[PDB]
Design a protein around this nucleic acid. Structure first.
Ligand SMILES: [Zn+2]
Lengths: 242, 212, 28, 31, 120, 331, 387, 141
RNA sequence: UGCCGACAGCGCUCUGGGGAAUUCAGGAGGGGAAAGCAGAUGUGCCCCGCGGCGAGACUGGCGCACCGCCGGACGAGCUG
């Protein structure tokens, strides 16, 4: 396997922020770590001594559907460095740490955890990384942190809830700039167990267009997870930013 | 000095550092999002800090000893360059006489051993200096001047080291009369440095408005 | 006319201080 | 408080802002 | 603390029924460590945790990774009944039944996970 | 950028006053051109994108000063026809767009208020004060100035209204509370000078709510006692002084401020054979407070400050003066 | 009609009076949405009327908690009283735009003269407020002390901390950086000890020939002054340093008598005694850390502290990274962290893992479970001795 | 696309989502056929039918003489999926939507449309055959 | 990924092809910018007209869960 201490190189990936570490027999995904030299979850990290302080962190795609989607090769995830990134589903903040490392010390992540102990993990990672603020409350009630979240540009969402479309609809209606960019994770077994998952995907899409989006890309993150679809869309317009 | 951010408005800070910062930090200890910790923890924290500042003062007085003892042994060299870099030299030397059997070029590149031997064993350009770079006098040169000062400081250092390493003194000998040669070297050499700093530039034909 | 601030009535008395001084002004 | 400025007035770019400054590759023959 | 507790009305018995079905179909990992490794490997279709267990921190630390992976976890009030419903001769406090691509037990899991999804 | 055009509006409206001043012998043509030029440059400066309250104040000072010069010069020319109305109105409009662009300047606000008050527009003044209070509800100084203007006019009910809304808001500092007590007792003094208020229980009441205020301190009650001790020539002044004393004795018993008020308590309306007798009484209080188990450094600092005021007042006896000097030196 | 609208944000809440309200049929027109985007057009709708910042972090904490619950706060009521023109809604009303329908209900309760529209339903006031948030920082700048950002971080951290009660059961960073300090300064004591040992035995090598315990070596070279000034049991020192009368002091005396090491200089002995004072203060610090961190280990995780021992068990805490990481790691991962040795290692791995999740997910832990688990390990040692 | 096994669609399960074409609708109500009854007949399967906004518009673009078919289309009990483009051009709307999802069964009657959809794999083709309906490329029947 | 590389085949492109300064003419994108002229009337008084709050005082009918509704028309005082 990709055992520790191997000499690999890092090159830029076409989305900003993310880099790709390639070496020997292994190619894999990585991001500049803000808080240098300290793991998040016993993740592997990459050192480099530049002519010291700079260190990167690998992601596991099996762990984060965000990673898996990038490896599948989405077009654009809208979260350039500097972009205010709402998260939904701060499942103890692993991928949230990764996305914080993307948006950097100039960006911002506002996170939503509903469970408490996961939230303890979450606020721990927030206490480390300054650019992510946590929010622990019910994502179904964006009134609960309407005082706390300003206008963000990209909504990531990965909650496993059956009302997912109306959830993202209301949170978008309260927190998204015209020209909104969003990604959402679909577990077809969670939305509708009986149905064929592709049609499940379609129904999700049509609910989202009903809630005024425009889908523009969509793929099964297949060789990293079964029956999940990443969907990329825009709020309220066609081209991405403005 | 400051205890907790609870103690922050009642902490006197002006004695170690000036203000205009140490009220910004008062605003910071107010506004800060730091979590609360016990006084039992703060005891350990503060005592660690007592440890480290004791360490700091210890190093400070150590350096005081180093400079004084260096003036005692080799006044010429510390009249040239300064006790710290002379100490580094003597360190890599092993001993004073171990230094004084070096030649001037050895002193010019004293230290840069991997770099030197790489460039030689594969015929690359040689390194220009070692510890003399961080020595005090060469910082006031510039570039090509830095190289010329590197050579000159090299040879005069070898001079001073052999001087203090072999020239006896009748022991009713004041340190100034003892270190007169390093003093001479200081004076001559600083003059040469100010000259090459003031070397002119190349006169060019002064163009007017037209090409004329 | 939100131009002015109106003298406070018991209907418009929010805090206990206002209630006390309004009681004093009423017995006045 | 109000002091004299310093004058320092005297190609494709060197480190990348859009990727946290990966430097341009120096090209050792080993690399 | 065990707020996703299951209730009496045959819900618990449906759980034990599908548990015995999974023990027969060999699609079931058992005991806290193996449940942990199955949900770490993400293969688990659903996870069931006892509630009468001597101090509950085991079946409290499991819902942490259940909340990470976002797998339906559910509290059952009798670990000895879990042992009997699995066929162990020992009382079990943590069980995890995984998913395969071809079964009708899978449809039973879908119904059961929809019920616990409405529950929590 | 439309700045030229917006300026075109304002300067074109400025025109006919200048037409009239041309048609009068009050100014000559080159002066007129100077005036128009300066006005245009200032107006452009105001409608610049990046502007600042100092620039605003600069401009309005320019115009107001022009008004005064015009007045002086037409007085010298003994001409009564010209008014100041148009200048004052355009001056107002300057203040209005100033507060639209920068609402957040107490400095510019108070300049506005003072401008209105010096020209005699009190209804407008109340409106402006209203908006400023609405934009900065923590500012004791504006709260005070509004309420003090209302009390000086006499509208005591609206004075109380401003002050109660302000004390409802600004609960970090005691400052408004002291100011409201100050003007309320001043109103009681106005009633006594004109000679319920027969009781005058209101400073007791504000002291009672002060007792549960967030800033509620011993030093707070001390300054309360100070402003109460001002203008003791009243009726229930001894009543309220006894009340504040017994309350802070009941609450902060051995506080050095409690000992300080225990000293300076019987000196309510005193200047005078009643002067040295109460002096000796408070001196017995002082010696008792000094020998008592209190923070003697704090109490002595309080006492030497009060003695600094005491020696600041004149007309006393030398033996008394020197024994105060000795009791101060012994601290 | 909308006449005012609320906006409750992390620096404070503020009300806008509306001039030239929205094209409500034309809310779905594109030029209307880009006109919502541009500041030069949306400011021709909204104008600022009153503003209220928070006084303190706890006050804003009260604000967010009451708001999240739905209930308004008293100072919000103060503000609304302070700005809205007085009436009861008999012959006229004033219309307010607010986010939370619950908050709207309570405001309609507190004032009959107003009609409050929740953004959940009235789509034009929803879009209006949404425009507000989108031109957020450019609206408060003339009186926004700082910017929204740092204050926002503070409000969020404070909220979720009070909601989940974090600090009362978080201490692991204290623990781990304690362990790191112990390890590092232990290494430091060792290197300082060997350095002072070499550098003074350069003057007097009979001392390193006679005594071990480099810490006691440091104490005695502190007490020694010079090799010249010797006496056995001078004052208060050798008695509690070591054996004083008949074992060590006379031996040290004869060692200095027969000594032949170099005569030391005064500045040199001053230097080396400065070093020795340093390292012995540091060793006293180490024992302080030992006592303290053992007490904190009893304070947080007693069970593992008694079944493995505080220093090494703490090493396992830190090498995991956290108590939460520790508990989530399965026992084989703890193993990564003959055959009898393998079996007993697996067994203690099971037991430390379960004791880990016990001591962690306990709110305020106990001791007896770790006690009985230690007894299980002891009787297992007896069972393995059986054979 | 997902669940596409070599020109066979494994995801097409009753309730079958079918798409309605204009000419299909026209000739069916010409043939006096109850659309849903005949659909459940040929399929022997529970159906939800879907009409695009383009199809609806094209019907209305046909004049008043088509009013019965228009009303038949506008019977409420069926889903209405919108479109977001400029075209209002039935065939392109269909081919694009079918390409994107690959879950439907198209019902048309033009042979050129049939060639078009026959170009892409894994879609079944419904056409009435003047006695009844007629399904082309669905294997489960 | 080193030069040069004959013929033949292909491409681009032709006031030949590079390169540097410098001049003008547009294009595309990133930030920064309260960027904010929907109807731009001096102040103060009183009076009139109209309108709002608004203490307080009535009154009509309705009211088979019976618990209270809803409506007229007076009104001190304040204010636009
Ligand atoms: Zn279409």
């Amino acid at each position: 396997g990709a055992k520790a201490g191997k000499k690999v190189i890092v090159e830029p990936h076409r989305h900003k922020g993310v880099f790709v570490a390639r070496g020997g027999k292994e190619d894999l995904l990585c991001t500049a770590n803000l808080v240098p030299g300290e793991s998040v979850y016993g993740e592997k990290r990459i050192s480099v001594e530049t002519p010291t302080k700079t260190e990167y962190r690998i992601w596991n795609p099996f762990r984060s559907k965000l990673a898996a989607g990038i490896l599948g090769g989405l077009e654009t995830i809208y979260m350039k460095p500097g972009s205010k990134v709402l998260y939904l589903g701060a499942a103890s903040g692993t991928s949230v740490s990764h996305v914080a490392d993307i948006v950097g010390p100039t960006g911002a992540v506002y996170a939503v955890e509903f469970s408490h102990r996961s939230g303890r993990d979450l606020i721990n990672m927030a206490t480390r990384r300054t650019n992510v603020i946590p929010i622990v409350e019910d994502a179904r009630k964006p009134m609960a942190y309407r005082m706390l979240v300003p206008m963000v540009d990209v909504i990531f969402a990965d909650v496993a809830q059956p009302d997912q479309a109306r959830i993202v609809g209301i949170n978008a209606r309260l927190f998204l700039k015209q020209g909104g960019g969003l990604l959402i994770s679909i577990k077809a077994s969670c939305i509708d167990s009986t149905a064929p998952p592709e049609q499940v995907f379609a129904s999700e899409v049509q609910k989202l267009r009903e809630d005024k989006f425009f889908p523009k890309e969509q793929l099964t993150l297949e060789p990293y997870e079964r029956d999940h679809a990443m969907v990329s869309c825009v709020y309220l317009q066609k081209e991405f930013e403005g | 000095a400051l205890g907790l951010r609870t103690n922050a408005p009642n902490a006197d800070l002006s004695e170690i550092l000036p203000p205009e910062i140490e009220a910004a930090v008062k605003a910071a200890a107010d506004i800060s999002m730091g979590t609360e910790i016990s006084t039992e923890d703060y005891e350990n924290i503060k005592l660690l800090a007592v440890q480290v500042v004791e360490r700091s003062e210890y190093r400070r007085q150590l350096a005081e000893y180093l400079q004084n003892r260096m003036k005692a042994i080799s006044p010429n060299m510390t009249e040239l360059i300064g006790a710290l870099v002379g100490a580094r030299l003597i360190a890599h030397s092993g001993s004073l006489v171990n230094l004084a059997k070096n030649p001037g070029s050895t002193i010019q590149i004293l230290g840069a051993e991997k770099a030197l031997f790489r460039a030689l064993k594969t015929k690359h350009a040689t390194p220009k200096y070692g510890i003399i770079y961080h020595a005090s006098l060469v910082g006031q040169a510039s570039g090509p001047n830095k190289g010329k000062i590197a050579r000159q400081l090299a040879a005069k250092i070898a001079l001073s080291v052999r001087t203090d390493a072999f020239e006896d003194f009748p022991e009713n000998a004041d340190d100034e009369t003892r270190a007169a040669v390093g003093i001479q070297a200081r004076a001559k050499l600083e003059n040469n440095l100010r000259l090459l700093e003031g070397k002119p530039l190349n006169k060019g034909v002064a163009l007017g408005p037209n090409g004329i | 006319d939100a131009s002015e601030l109106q003298p406070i009535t018991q209907k418009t008395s929010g805090t206990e201080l206002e209630q006390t001084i309004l009681a004093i002004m009423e017995e006045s | 408080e109000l002091s004299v400025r310093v004058p320092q007035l005297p190609g494709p770019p060197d480190t990348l802002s859009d990727w946290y400054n990966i430097p341009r590759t120096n090209l050792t023959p080993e690399l | 603390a065990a707020w996703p507790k299951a209730e009496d009305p045959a819900l618990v018995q449906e759980l034990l029924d599908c548990v015995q079905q999974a023990s027969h179909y060999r699609q079931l990992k058992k005991g806290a460590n193996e449940t942990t490794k199955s949900v770490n490997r993400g293969t688990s279709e659903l996870v069931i945790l006892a509630a009468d267990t001597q101090p509950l921190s085991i079946v409290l630390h499991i819902p942490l990774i259940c909340e990470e992976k976002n797998v339906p976890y559910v509290y059952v009030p009798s670990k000895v009944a879990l042992g009997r419903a699995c066929g162990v001769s020992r009382a079990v406090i943590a069980v995890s039944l995984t998913s395969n691509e071809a079964s009708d037990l899978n449809s039973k899991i879908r119904a059961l996970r929809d019920k616990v999804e409405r529950l929590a | 950028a439309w700045v030229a055009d917006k300026a075109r509006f304002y300067l074109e409206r400025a025109a006919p006053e200048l037409r009239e001043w041309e048609e009068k012998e009050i100014f000559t043509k080159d002066e007129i051109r100077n005036l128009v030029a300066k006005r245009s440059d200032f107006e452009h400066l105001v409608l610049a994108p990046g502007t600042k309250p100092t620039d605003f104040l600069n401009y309005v000072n320019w115009e107001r000063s022009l008004d005064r010069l015009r007045a002086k010069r037409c007085a010298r020319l003994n001409i009564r026809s010209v008014t100041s109305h148009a200048s004052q109105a355009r001056t107002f409009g300057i203040f209005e767009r100033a507060v639209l662009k920068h609402p957040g300047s107490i400095e510019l606000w108070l300049a506005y208020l003072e401008f209105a008050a010096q020209v005699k527009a009190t209804k407008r003044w109340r409106r402006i004060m209203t908006r400023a209070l609405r934009l900065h509800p923590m500012n004791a100084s504006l709260w005070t100035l509004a309420g003090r203007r209302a009390a000086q006019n006499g509208d005591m009910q609206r004075a109380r209204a401003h002050f109660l809304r302000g004390c409802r808001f600004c609960t970090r500092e005691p400052t408004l509370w002291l100011e409201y007590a100050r003007c309320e007792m001043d109103w009681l003094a106005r009633m006594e000078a004109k000679k319920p208020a027969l009781s005058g229980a209101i400073p007791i009441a504000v002291f009672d709510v002060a007792r549960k205020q967030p800033f509620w301190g011993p030093a707070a009650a001390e300054k309360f006692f100070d402003v109460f001790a001002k203008f003791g020539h009243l009726s229930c002044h001894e009543r309220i002084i006894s009340h504040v004393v017994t309350t802070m004795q009941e609450l902060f018993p051995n506080h050095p401020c409690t000992w300080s008020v225990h000293i300076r308590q019987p000196l309510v309306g005193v200047d005078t054979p009643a002067f040295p007798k109460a002096l000796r009484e408070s001196l017995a209080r002082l010696k008792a407070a000094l020998q008592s188990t209190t923070d003697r450094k704090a109490l002595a600092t309080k006492m030497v400050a009060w003695m600094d005021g005491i020696l600041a007042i004149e007309k006393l006896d030398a033996a008394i003066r020197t024994v105060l000097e000795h009791t101060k030196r012994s601290l | 009609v909308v006449n005012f609208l609320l906006f409750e944000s992390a620096v404070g809440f503020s009300l806008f009076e509306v001039v030239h309200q929205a094209d409500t049929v034309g809310l779905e027109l594109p030029e209307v949405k880009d006109a919502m985007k541009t500041l030069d057009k949306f400011g021709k709708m909204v104008k600022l009327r009153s503003f209220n910042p928070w006084t303190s972090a706890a006050q804003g904490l009260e604000a967010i908690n009451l708001i999240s619950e739905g209930i308004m706060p008293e100072y919000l009521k103060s503000a609304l009283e302070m700005n809205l023109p007085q009436t009861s809604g008999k012959k006229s009303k004033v219309v307010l735009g607010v986010a939370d329908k619950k908050l709207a209900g309570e405001i309609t309760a507190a004032f009959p003269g107003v009609q409050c529209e929740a953004a959940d339903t009235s789509e034009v006031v929803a879009a209006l407020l949404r425009g507000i948030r989108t031109h957020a920082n450019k609206l408060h700048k003339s009186l926004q002390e700082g910017d929204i950002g740092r204050a926002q971080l503070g409000l969020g951290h404070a909220y979720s901390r009070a909601k989940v009660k974090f600090s009362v059961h978080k201490n692991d960073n204290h623990i781990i950086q304690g362990i790191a300090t112990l390890d590092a300064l232990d290494k430091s004591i060792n290197q300082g000890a060997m350095r002072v040992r070499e550098w003074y035995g350069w003057h007097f090598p009979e001392l390193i020939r006679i005594v071990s315990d480099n810490i006691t070596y440091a104490k005695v070279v502190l007490a020694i002054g010079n090799k010249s000034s010797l006496t056995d049991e001078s004052v208060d020192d050798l008695a509690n340093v070591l054996n004083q009368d008949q074992d060590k002091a006379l031996a040290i005396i004869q060692a200095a008598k027969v000594s032949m090491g170099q005569d030391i200089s005064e500045v040199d002995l001053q230097m080396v005694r400065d070093l020795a004072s340093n390292v012995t203060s540091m060793a006293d610090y180490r024992r302080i850390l030992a006592e303290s961190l053992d007490k904190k280990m009893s304070e947080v995780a007693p069970n593992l502290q008694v079944i493995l021992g505080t220093p090494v068990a703490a090493r396992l805490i830190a090498h995991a990274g956290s108590l939460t990481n520790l508990a989530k790691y399965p026992a084989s991962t703890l193993q990564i962290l003959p055959k009898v040795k393998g079996r007993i290692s697996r067994y203690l791995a099971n037991k430390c893992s379960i004791a880990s999740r016990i001591d962690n997910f306990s709110e305020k832990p106990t001791r007896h479970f770790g006690e009985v688990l230690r007894q299980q390990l002891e009787q297992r040692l007896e069972w393995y001795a059986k054979g | 696309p997902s669940s596409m096994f070599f020109e066979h669609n494994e995801a097409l399960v009753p309730p079958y989502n079918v798409l309605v074409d204009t000419n299909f609708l026209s000739r069916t109500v010409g043939a006096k056929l109850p659309l849903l009854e005949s659909a459940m007949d040929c399929l022997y399967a529970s159906v939800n039918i879907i009409i695009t906004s383009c199809v609806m518009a094209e019907l209305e673009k046909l004049g008043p003489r088509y009013r019965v078919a228009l009303m038949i289309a506008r019977d409420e009990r069926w889903q209405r999926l919108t479109c977001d483009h400029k075209g209002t051009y039935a065939d392109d709307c269909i081919v694009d939507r079918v390409q994107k999802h690959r879950i439907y069964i198209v019902a048309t009657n033009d042979r050129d449309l049939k060639r078009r959809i026959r170009k892409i794999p894994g879609v079944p083709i419904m056409s009435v055959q003047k006695g009844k309906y007629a399904i082309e490329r669905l294997p489960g029947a």
